[PDB]
Amino acid sequence: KHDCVICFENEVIAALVPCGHNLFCMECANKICEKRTPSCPVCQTAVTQAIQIHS
Amino acid sequence: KHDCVICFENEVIAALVPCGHNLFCMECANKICEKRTPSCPVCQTAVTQAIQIHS
Ligand SMILES: [Zn+2]
Ligand SMILES: [Zn+2]
Ligand SMILES: [Zn+2]
Ligand SMILES: [Zn+2]
């Protein structure tokens, strides 16, 4: 429950659109979204939104 | 290992946007988007795209 690759504190629950990388908690994903130039920190693809993943 | 909830034949690979339901193979998710009133079969939310999820 500590597997977010950004903060390593929260649980992974979010994926970025459209690259689909599912490696982030929602707080870190939201922070990615309101950067000046939102982009995936892993693959650098531009980010248009973050979604919570439901499996 | 998870089975697509539509066909129960292929692995789960894709999620719908924006509801984030991650329960579909890419073929079944593509079929969802290509319909004329696209909506998630699980929660009935309108679907604006389907993406492959990378975990
Ligand atoms: Zn985080
Ligand atoms: Zn990415
Ligand atoms: Zn399927
Ligand atoms: Zn849904």
Tokens of A34: 């309101």
Please report, for residues A31, B7, B14, B47, the alpha-carbon distance to residue A17 in angstroms, rounded to integers and kept in the order given. 14, 25, 12, 13
User: 10 Å Cβ neighbour count for B2?
Assistant: 11
Q: Which residue type, as a one-letter code, is found at position B31?
A: K
On whether the CB atoms of residues B50 and B17 are closer than 8 A, the answer is yes
CA distance B55 to B49: 19
Q: What is the resolution of this structure in A?
A: 2.2
Experiment used for this model: X-ray
The residues spanned by each domain of chain B are 1-55
CA A17 to chain centre: 9
CB contact under 8 A, B52 and A15: no
Please report, for residues A14, A22, B6, the alpha-carbon distance to residue B30 in angstroms, rounded to integers and kept in the order given. 21, 19, 12
* Closest chain A residue by Cα to residue B52: A20
User: 10 Å Cβ neighbour count for B17?
Assistant: 22
